[PDB]
């Protein structure tokens, strides 16, 4: 079941005494006339505070349980009250799934690491909240489906616990020989204090238009007239990011589909610039690739550009592909092609026996075998100096301890896989203080019209309704501005059509009241709002749309002036 609260869940927001002062406060309350669940049990959510009322002369409610897991292995709050007094306690418990001579307390079976102790019909109201690690309880016990009235609740405890709460339960006294659960929302009230300093009345500042007038005027009695209380603001829906078609294309073809790759010792570096195209265009014709890209999937880098991209390509044996990766050692990684420890690109390698081996032996591709020192990352060495392993100078002729340092792979088609040739393409991506000239897509998306939307046209960010225009740009202009230099028209990059941008209707909201001493009926005027864009009696005036008043054909003396010859009165 569900019930309707009336004016319940109002508590003293703080200390600080006070006299006859219509004070306005913002805090966590139970909204007036709210939808409160009814229970006669299961774990309930917390989310932000709790209202808890009940009715019964006896005491059926035997404490609460709070916390994040409501189980062991972590600490929780437990509040009980035997016939003595309230007992706050914060330990790590082990709760019965169904907690409940005259012997009792079968709720838990563990109380470890206690960090807090304390010992010491009818309506029993409570307000629970948990802010900055403090668990507050307000309460009041007033003697008499709940009735109808107002009563402010006073602080009960102050508990510096630190506990987090996301769920809670309740405890009931069974028979062996009714309660409410609301939640709190951030609202604003106007509180009336008497001379004794207690709260006697309140206004919920987010309900009826008349209450908004009371709150703006700081009174509970409004005199006849028309009051401006707030405003109407249409809100935009959806976020459409429009963009142009892929300008140019990055010449990856001429890198991967080249007829001849370099030797690894003399690896080839193609620098890429100023070419748009999604980054997942590669790994198409997927299931042969050794695609290994480190620290980022191609999905994530597909929508992240870069200033420059470098394409290094060479040829090695399958056995050695493993060396084309950061932090490896061997002839290739020490002497030919070293990747840095902090590498942020990809390695693509595929087998090319059909292209780079032949029966007589393909001696085209070489690799460096000897070198005095390991390469710094991305270093190239093409010198053909004789490597001096002995202690006699070599003077440039091979001989004893004098080795020409480039050998030759011997690629024949009958080698095993690990001795066959593999072509390798190494992609590096860099970021600098220069504009990023290499990017894939921008996020495809369609285009709607006649709706307040959040739009972006290749950099132009704004909000408004898009409509067909009747302007004519020059054949080089993208967008137009009005007088006072604000954008009012754009051109769609894809379809090349001019669209106007109009603001999404706004205006003041006024409340028309006969006076609280006459009636509580009210009508509302939306200033210069069309009656089709507002969300009975709807009346269109040159001043806006008037809702809640009937328009008659008679003519009276003006009482409450609306505008443009229209007045309102409380007569018929």
């Amino acid at each position, epitope marked *: 079941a569900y019930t309707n609260s009336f004016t319940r869940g109002v508590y003293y927001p703080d200390k600080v005494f006070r006299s006859s002062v219509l004070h306005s406060t913002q805090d966590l309350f139970l909204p007036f006339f709210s939808n409160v669940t009814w229970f006669h049990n299961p774990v309930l959510p917390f989310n932000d505070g709790v209202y808890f009322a009940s009715i019964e002369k006896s005491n059926i409610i035997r404490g609460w349980i709070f916390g994040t897991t409501l189980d062991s292995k972590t600490q929780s709050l437990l509040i009980v009250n035997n016939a003595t007094n309230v007992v706050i306690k914060v330990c790590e418990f082990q709760f019965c799934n169904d907690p409940f001579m005259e012997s009792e307390f079968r709720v838990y079976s563990s109380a470890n690491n206690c960090t807090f102790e304390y010992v010491s019909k009818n309506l029993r109201e409570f307000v629970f909240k948990n802010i900055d690690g403090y668990f507050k309880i307000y309460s009041k016990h007033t003697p008499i489906d709940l009735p109808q009235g107002f009563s402010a609740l006073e602080p009960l405890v102050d508990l510096p616990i630190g506990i987090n709460i996301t769920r809670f339960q309740t405890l009931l006294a069974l028979h062996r020989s009714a309660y409410y659960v609301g939640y709190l929302q951030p609202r604003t009230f106007l509180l009336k204090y008497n001379e004794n300093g207690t709260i006697t009345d309140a206004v919920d500042c987010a309900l009826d238009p008349l209450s908004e007038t009371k709150c703006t005027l700081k009174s509970f009695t409004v005199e006849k007239g028309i009051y401006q209380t707030s405003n109407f603001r249409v809100q935009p829906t959806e976020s459409i990011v429009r963009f142009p078609n892929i300008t140019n294309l990055c010449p990856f073809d001429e890198v991967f589909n080249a007829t001849r790759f370099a030797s690894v010792y003399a690896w080839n570096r193609k620098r890429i610039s100023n070419c748009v195209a999604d980054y997942s265009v590669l790994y198409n014709l*997927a*299931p042969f690739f050794t695609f290994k890209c480190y620290g980022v999937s191609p999905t994530k880098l597909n929508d992240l550009c870069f200033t420059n991209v470098y394409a290094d390509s060479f040829v090695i044996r399958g*056995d050695e592909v493993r*060396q084309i*990766a950061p932090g490896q050692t061997g002839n290739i990684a020490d002497y030919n092609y070293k990747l840095p420890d902090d590498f942020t690109g990809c*390695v693509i390698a595929w087998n090319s026996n059909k292209l780079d081996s032949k029966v007589s032996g393909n001696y085209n591709y070489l690799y460096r075998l000897f070198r005095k020192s390991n390469l710094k990352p991305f270093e190239r060495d093409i010198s053909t100096e004789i490597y001096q392993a002995g202690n006699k100078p070599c003077n440039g002729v091979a001989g004893f301890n004098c080795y020409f340092p480039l050998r030759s792979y011997s690629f024949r088609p009958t080698y095993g896989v*690990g001795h066959q040739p593999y072509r390798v393409v190494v992609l590096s991506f860099e970021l600098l203080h220069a504009p990023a000239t290499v990017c894939g897509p921008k996020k495809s998306t369609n285009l709607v019209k006649n709706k307040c939307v959040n739009f972006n046209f290749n950099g132009l960010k704004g909000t408004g309704v898009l409509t067909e225009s009747n302007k004519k740009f020059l054949p080089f202009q993208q967008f137009g501005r009005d007088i006072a230099d604000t954008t009012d028209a754009v051109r769609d990059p894809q379809t090349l059509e001019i669209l106007d941008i109009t603001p999404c209707s706004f205006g003041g909201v006024s409340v028309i009241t006969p006076g609280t001493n006459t009636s509580n009926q009210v009508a509302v005027l939306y200033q210069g709002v069309n009656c089709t864009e507002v969300p009975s009696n709807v009346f269109q005036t040159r001043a806006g749309c008037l809702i809640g008043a009937e328009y008659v054909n008679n003519s009276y003396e003006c009482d409450i002036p609306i505008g443009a010859g229209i007045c309102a009165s409380y007569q018929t």
Partner: antibody
Amino acid sequence: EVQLVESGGGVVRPGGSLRLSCAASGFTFDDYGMSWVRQAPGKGLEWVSGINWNGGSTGYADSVKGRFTISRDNAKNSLYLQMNSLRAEDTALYHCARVGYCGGDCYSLSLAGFPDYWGQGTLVTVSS
Amino acid sequence: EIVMTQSPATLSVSPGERATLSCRASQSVSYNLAWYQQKPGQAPRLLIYDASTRATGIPARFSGSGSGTEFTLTISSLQSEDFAVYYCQQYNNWPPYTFGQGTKLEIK
């Protein structure tokens, strides 16, 4: 931590069909290939099928070709094995595995290297 | 298919001693070989990949070696928790990936 949780194992009649599922957590799922491996009671491991990181390349063992179909949902971090025309010889514990990326450019065909993380598996029993 | 043949089928070794397991591929798998440990009622665990690269969090006692067709797993000083079935796997050609028949390591 990387976790792989298999479901959809059970008893099925010969010629029947079953659909295994594996939920993956604790890693970027679209950044890895996935495989199924099975183990019959008291036998060694048999690789069944695998799929690359985007789902654009699949492979199957000769014992299950044309009967089984591997698929993945990257938005759900989930791997599936549709098994049709089941036989008594298909009775096994089925493990889903994340396929590790070998020591760098391993030159391997698809994104499937070696299984690096394994789920505990789900039992499939094919009996009349 | 590439056939992976392990030897011995069973190996009985005392705690503290060195254990060595062999795996032979019927064709060259280059360095595309992994080693796994499987305990009763547990999923297989990767020990070595790339014939010799130790997986993260695997103890230093475990080492792999070999290339082409012949591979070994060595346990330098056997612990009580190392008694298990060990599998080699090739991943050089996809598909199929193939496992060895397993080697049972037991207490002598």
